[PDB]
Design an enzyme around this catalytic site. Structure first.
Site, mmCIF file in Angstrom:
data_model
loop_
_atom_site.group_PDB
_atom_site.id
_atom_site.type_symbol
_atom_site.label_atom_id
_atom_site.label_comp_id
_atom_site.label_asym_id
_atom_site.label_seq_id
_atom_site.Cartn_x
_atom_site.Cartn_y
_atom_site.Cartn_z
ATOM 1 N N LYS A 85 24.177 4.371 81.760
ATOM 2 C CA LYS A 85 24.527 3.321 80.815
ATOM 3 C C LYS A 85 23.256 2.681 80.291
ATOM 4 O O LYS A 85 22.476 2.090 81.051
ATOM 5 C CB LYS A 85 25.455 2.273 81.448
ATOM 6 N N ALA A 112 30.535 -3.112 74.356
ATOM 7 C CA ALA A 112 29.815 -4.321 73.970
ATOM 8 C C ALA A 112 28.471 -4.401 74.696
ATOM 9 O O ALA A 112 27.460 -4.779 74.097
ATOM 10 C CB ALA A 112 30.655 -5.560 74.248
ATOM 11 N N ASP A 138 34.279 -9.275 84.407
ATOM 12 C CA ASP A 138 34.867 -8.385 83.383
ATOM 13 C C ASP A 138 35.796 -7.375 84.040
ATOM 14 O O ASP A 138 35.771 -6.180 83.716
ATOM 15 C CB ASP A 138 33.737 -7.682 82.581
ATOM 16 N N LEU A 177 29.533 9.634 76.499
ATOM 17 C CA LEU A 177 30.902 9.377 76.974
ATOM 18 C C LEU A 177 31.556 8.337 76.050
ATOM 19 O O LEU A 177 32.580 8.603 75.444
ATOM 20 C CB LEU A 177 30.923 8.944 78.447
ATOM 21 N N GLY A 178 30.942 7.167 75.907
ATOM 22 C CA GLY A 178 31.506 6.169 75.006
ATOM 23 C C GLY A 178 30.661 4.938 74.833
ATOM 24 O O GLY A 178 29.684 4.742 75.553
HETATM 25 O O1 LIG Z 1 34.260 7.122 79.633
HETATM 26 C C1 LIG Z 1 33.644 6.347 80.359
HETATM 27 N N1 LIG Z 1 33.094 5.175 79.914
HETATM 28 C C2 LIG Z 1 32.619 5.076 78.552
HETATM 29 C C3 LIG Z 1 33.410 4.051 77.777
HETATM 30 O O2 LIG Z 1 34.767 4.468 77.787
HETATM 31 C C4 LIG Z 1 33.418 6.627 81.804
HETATM 32 C C5 LIG Z 1 32.273 6.194 82.338
HETATM 33 C C6 LIG Z 1 31.788 6.382 83.720
HETATM 34 C C7 LIG Z 1 32.070 7.499 84.508
HETATM 35 N N2 LIG Z 1 31.524 7.624 85.731
HETATM 36 C C8 LIG Z 1 30.715 6.653 86.146
HETATM 37 N N3 LIG Z 1 30.388 5.552 85.461
HETATM 38 C C9 LIG Z 1 30.922 5.438 84.246
HETATM 39 N N4 LIG Z 1 30.575 4.281 83.479
HETATM 40 C C10 LIG Z 1 29.646 3.329 83.905
HETATM 41 C C11 LIG Z 1 29.976 1.986 84.058
HETATM 42 C C12 LIG Z 1 29.013 1.085 84.456
HETATM 43 C C13 LIG Z 1 27.727 1.519 84.711
HETATM 44 O O3 LIG Z 1 26.737 0.626 85.087
HETATM 45 C C14 LIG Z 1 27.044 -0.382 85.999
HETATM 46 C C15 LIG Z 1 27.087 -1.702 85.581
HETATM 47 C C16 LIG Z 1 27.371 -2.727 86.458
HETATM 48 C C17 LIG Z 1 27.620 -2.478 87.794
HETATM 49 C C18 LIG Z 1 27.575 -1.149 88.182
HETATM 50 S S1 LIG Z 1 27.822 -0.483 89.746
HETATM 51 C C19 LIG Z 1 27.572 1.151 89.304
HETATM 52 C C20 LIG Z 1 27.287 1.174 87.964
HETATM 53 C C21 LIG Z 1 27.287 -0.097 87.317
HETATM 54 C C22 LIG Z 1 27.384 2.851 84.561
HETATM 55 CL CL1 LIG Z 1 25.765 3.369 84.880
HETATM 56 C C23 LIG Z 1 28.343 3.748 84.156
HETATM 57 N N5 LIG Z 1 32.924 8.570 84.186
HETATM 58 C C24 LIG Z 1 33.673 8.677 82.939
HETATM 59 C C25 LIG Z 1 34.417 7.399 82.568
#
Ligand SMILES: O=C(NCCO)C1=Cc2c(ncnc2Nc2ccc(Oc3cccc4sccc34)c(Cl)c2)NCC1
Length: 297
Positions: free
Chosen positions: A45, A22, A132, A18-19
């Site tokens: 992530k 940092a 953040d 996805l992307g």
């Molecule tokens: O394009 C994207 N992002 C890339 C950079 O642009 C998108 C990412 C996108 C998504 N759905 C779902 N989570 C996403 N991100 C994401 C963001 C954070 C994460 O971890 C955490 C860190 C801290 C607290 C908490 S609490 C739940 C997860 C979490 C995790 Cl695991 C995934 N759908 C598409 C949009």
């Protein structure tokens, strides 16, 4: 039955990137819990400190149960930390407002402000400082329902200076009231349909600008009433900034009469793409799959 699920590497797969960020790289993937015979669409992530400490902090992340806050479903600890959560198929709100600018009405914008304030107030009840908050860290579950994510990573592990409260910049002080400052900036991003805050100004000059009393400008669609909320979020005295509970009340009031508070040409006639219309939705979701929500029942 664990609140924070510990996943084996064989229990999930990264399908596409996805992307980047940092903190780490996020993938679209599938969670296939061992023996349970189901496939769940997830984001994964992978992040760039002992295990038991990472788990301790992650547990608080898995604990959050509010409609406006993303919940951590699981973690995998190997040479890397990987976080697994429900895939939000409409992307982040920053990209969403940029893409759909001509079809976003006042009702939607103010409702998103309410939703974000409700999620942040929940985090405050959980004693979890976000650190953040930004439009890039609010995800779109549906056009009418956004959720906060990426909270507490900063703790668990390049600072986002242009979203930071002056006391965080100067003294590394992070509180729920510094999150309120970041909320102000996030609201500004929504009301500008995704402008970059202090565009052009180097990060190194931001603290002096703020000390000199300069702030982000009034968005063109905002009445003074709405801009005054933003400006209060950026007061030097952190204790004098609004609290999230007060922001829920104020934006909820505004959301009941949205055209009094935001001035948007053609507000009356705006309509947003459904799941089957959305390019972004279709891009991610394109078989035999089960939504995390339905699974988590
Ligand atoms: O394009 C994207 N992002 C890339 C950079 O642009 C998108 C990412 C996108 C998504 N759905 C779902 N989570 C996403 N991100 C994401 C963001 C954070 C994460 O971890 C955490 C860190 C801290 C607290 C908490 S609490 C739940 C997860 C979490 C995790 Cl695991 C995934 N759908 C598409 C949009």
């Amino acid at each position: 039955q664990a609140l924070l699920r510990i996943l084996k590497e064989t229990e999930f797969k990264k399908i596409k990137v996805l992307g980047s960020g940092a903190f780490g790289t996020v993938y679209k993937g599938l969670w296939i819990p061992e023996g349970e015979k189901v496939k769940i669409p997830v984001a994964i992530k992978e992040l760039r400190k002992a295990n038991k400490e990472i788990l301790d902090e992650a547990y608080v992340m898995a604990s959050v149960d509010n409609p406006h806050v993303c919940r951590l479903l699981g973690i995998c600890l190997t040479s890397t930390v990987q976080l697994i959560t429900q895939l939000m198929p409409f992307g982040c709100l920053l990209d969403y407002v940029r893409e759909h600018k001509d079809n976003i009405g006042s009702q939607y914008l103010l409702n998103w402000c309410v939703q974000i304030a409700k999620g942040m107030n929940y985090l405050e009840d959980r004693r979890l400082v976000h650190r953040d908050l930004a439009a890039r860290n609010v995800l779109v579950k549906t056009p009418q329902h956004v959720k906060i994510t990426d909270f507490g990573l900063a703790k668990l592990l390049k600072v986002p200076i242009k979203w930071m409260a002056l006391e965080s910049i100067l003294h590394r002080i992070y509180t729920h009231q510094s999150d309120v400052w970041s909320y102000g900036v996030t609201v500004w991003e929504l009301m500008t349909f995704g402008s970059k805050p202090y565009d052009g100004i180097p990060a190194s000059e931001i603290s002096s600008i703020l000390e000199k009393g300069e702030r982000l400008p009034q968005p063109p669609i905002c009445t003074i009433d709405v801009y005054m909320i933003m400006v209060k979020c950026w007061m030097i005295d952190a204790d004098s900034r609004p609290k999230f509970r007060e922001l829920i009340i104020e934006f909820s009031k505004m959301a009941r009469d949205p055209q009094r508070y935001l001035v948007i040409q053609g507000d009356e006639r705006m309509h947003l793409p459904s799941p089957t219309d959305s390019n972004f939705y279709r891009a991610l979701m394109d078989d035999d799959v089960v939504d995390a929500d339905e699974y988590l029942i």
